[PDB]
Amino acid sequence: SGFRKMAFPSGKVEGCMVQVTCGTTTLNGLWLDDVVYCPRHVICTSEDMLNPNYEDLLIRKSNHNFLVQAGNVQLRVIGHSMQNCVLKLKVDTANPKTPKYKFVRIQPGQTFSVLACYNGSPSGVYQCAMRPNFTIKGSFLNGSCGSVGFNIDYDCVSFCYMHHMELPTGVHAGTDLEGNFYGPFVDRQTAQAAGTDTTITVNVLAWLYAAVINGDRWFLNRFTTTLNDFNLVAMKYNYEPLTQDHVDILGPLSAQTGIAVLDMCASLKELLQNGMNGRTILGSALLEDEFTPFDVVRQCSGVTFQ
């Protein structure tokens, strides 16, 4: 028993991190087979950031302008290309530590582990969710760009996030590994802001199921609710609407605990209406929304990875 913010083991990704240096800018890159992926604003200078035209900027670069360091080893760039907001540097050496991997673009609400890096060197790993406003509440300092977010399924690494920028409220924006930003953000230093966020309802419900699996039942009640009446209360508290698809996904957790999904909804409704009244759930005094139904089942049942 117990329940923790659990990240995936990071070793398969650690063996892919490298340093990419161009001009006066150093950041991280991801080395898979003979290609190194990194944010295209590495080719920007301190005066290009305002409204850069990356196509102009890139046609002006030579291969030898890109300095790629993998440990104590320099890789030579033999080609480059831009795909949306990511730069792809072809190098003459295939990374022998390349895991099995996919690139996937995730939906708001899904979670992933972030391996935070500086100068191609991993610093720490933590669990994140893509927020409904397509930011992530990360932990990132200067030089962290090019750090990736990821999931693992058995032996396959599904990369879903590369870090690009911090927004004025201290939250973070980035792209999938094909260079498409999550959300309306763009990689130029112009006024942008996160947009109003909401709480991921389906995830709060899964975490309440986790609490029941772990012995916390104080928040349950005998009541039930309809989906309509639940969603009417959720809107008032700035919660994402719950759909029938969400209900269906919460099926396995419902059947294992014996608490119908709509009954757990009735319970969350009273938690929103009455607060927690100085009590905690799974060590939290807040309703936690960064565990998906899959995260709960994974941790409360013990799925491993090779």
Ligand X SMILES: *C(=N)[C@H](C[C@@H]1CCNC1=O)NC(=O)[C@H](CC1CCCCC1)NC(=O)[C@@H](NC(=O)OCc1ccccc1)[C@@H](C)OC(C)(C)C
Q: List residues with catalytic annotation.
A: 41, 145
Report the residue from 6, 11, 45, 49 that binds ligand X according to the rule CB under 6 A. Answer: 49
Q: Which does 304 bind (CB under 5 to 8 A by kind): ligand X, a copy of itself, none?
A: a copy of itself
Which of 273, 283, 291, 299 lies closest to 216, judged by CA? 283
Could you tell me if 160 and 109 are in contact, meaning their C-beta atoms sit under 8 angstroms apart?
A: no
Could you tell me if 212 and 232 are in contact, meaning their C-beta atoms sit under 8 angstroms apart?
A: no
Looking at the Cβ atoms of 50 and 96, the one nearer to ligand X is 50
Does residue 182 belong to the site contacting a copy of itself (CB under 8 A)? no
Could you tell me if 172 and 166 are in contact, meaning their C-beta atoms sit under 8 angstroms apart?
A: yes
Report the residue from 24, 96, 154, 168 that binds ligand X according to the rule CB under 6 A. Answer: 168
Does residue 93 belong to the site contacting ligand X (CB under 6 A)? no
Does residue 306 belong to the site contacting a copy of itself (CB under 8 A)? yes
Does residue 232 belong to the site contacting a copy of itself (CB under 8 A)? no
Please state the closest distance from residue 118 (CB atom) to a copy of itself, in A. Answer: 5
Does residue 74 belong to the site contacting a copy of itself (CB under 8 A)? no
Please state the closest distance from residue 115 (CB atom) to a copy of itself, in A. Answer: 7
For 265, the 3-state DSSP assignment is: helix
Neighbours of 101 (CB within 10 A): 20
CA distance 25 to 21: 6
Does residue 117 belong to the site contacting a copy of itself (CB under 8 A)? yes
Stretch that binds a copy of itself, among 38-46, 102-110, 131-139, 255-263 (CB under 8 A): 131-139
Q: Which does 116 bind (CB under 5 to 8 A by kind): ligand X, a copy of itself, none?
A: a copy of itself
Which residues inside 176-195 make contact with ligand X, applying CB under 6 A?
A: 187-192
Does residue 124 belong to the site contacting a copy of itself (CB under 8 A)? yes
Does residue 166 belong to the site contacting ligand X (CB under 6 A)? yes
Going residue by residue from 256 to 285, which x/- string records binding to a copy of itself, judged by CB under 8 A? Answer: ------------------------x--xxx
Which of 25, 16, 13, 10 lies closest to 145, judged by CA? 25
Does residue 109 belong to the site contacting a copy of itself (CB under 8 A)? no
Could you tell me if 105 and 57 are in contact, meaning their C-beta atoms sit under 8 angstroms apart?
A: no
Could you tell me if 48 and 58 are in contact, meaning their C-beta atoms sit under 8 angstroms apart?
A: no
Could you tell me if 44 and 57 are in contact, meaning their C-beta atoms sit under 8 angstroms apart?
A: yes
Could you tell me if 35 and 79 are in contact, meaning their C-beta atoms sit under 8 angstroms apart?
A: no
For 246, the 3-state DSSP assignment is: helix
The phi-psi region of residue 49 (left if phi > 0; otherwise alpha if psi is between -120 and 50; otherwise beta) is alpha
Name, in order, each residue with C-beta under 8 angstroms of 133's C-beta and a sequence gap of 6 or more. 108, 183, 194, 195, 196, 197, 198
CA distance 231 to 201: 10
Going residue by residue from 122 to 141, which x/- string records binding to ligand X, judged by CB under 6 A? Answer: ------------------xx
Q: Which does 145 bind (CB under 5 to 8 A by kind): a copy of itself, ligand X, none?
A: ligand X
Residues binding a copy of itself (CB under 8 A): 1-12, 14-15, 71, 115-119, 121-126, 128, 137-144, 166, 170-172, 214-215, 280, 283-286, 298-306
Residues binding ligand X (CB under 6 A): 27, 41, 44, 49, 140-145, 165-168, 172, 187-192
